[PDB]
Design a protein around this nucleic acid. Structure first.
Ligand SMILES: [Zn+2]
Ligand SMILES: [Zn+2]
Length: 93
DNA sequence: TACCGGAAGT
DNA sequence: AACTTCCGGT
């Protein structure tokens, strides 16, 4: 009985609340964001999905799977920085 | 330590 | 399917 929330939706959720700006913030006005506190975001994700051993290593692997899906891409040469391929298009399905 | 995609588990 | 868990190579 966990949250049916998706990982990219969960990130979008954190990005909506100022309370989480210290751990994840927007770095552009076109979908780019940065995991300021990557392990903290990962622990939060594990609590949500009920995976106590969740860490940034495995969360990042999930993000890498989004490259193929064209949901999220990596911002090359910028640690912890990623970009939503089509934000906010992904919010008006 | 970050990032990457293959392979297998849930 | 959408991750989760490992692994070895850049
Ligand atoms: Zn639209
Ligand atoms: Zn390794």
């Amino acid at each position: 009985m966990d949250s049916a929330i998706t990982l990219w939706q969960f990130l979008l959720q954190l990005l909506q609340k100022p309370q989480n700006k210290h751990m994840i913030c927007w770095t552009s006005n076109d979908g780019q964001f940065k995991l300021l506190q990557a392990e903290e975001v990962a622990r939060l994700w594990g609590i949500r999905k009920n995976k106590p051993n969740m860490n940034y290593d495995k969360l990042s692997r999930a993000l890498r799977y989004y490259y193929v899906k064209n949901i999220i891409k990596k911002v090359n040469g910028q640690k912890f920085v990623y970009k939503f391929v089509s934000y906010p298009e992904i919010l008006n399905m």
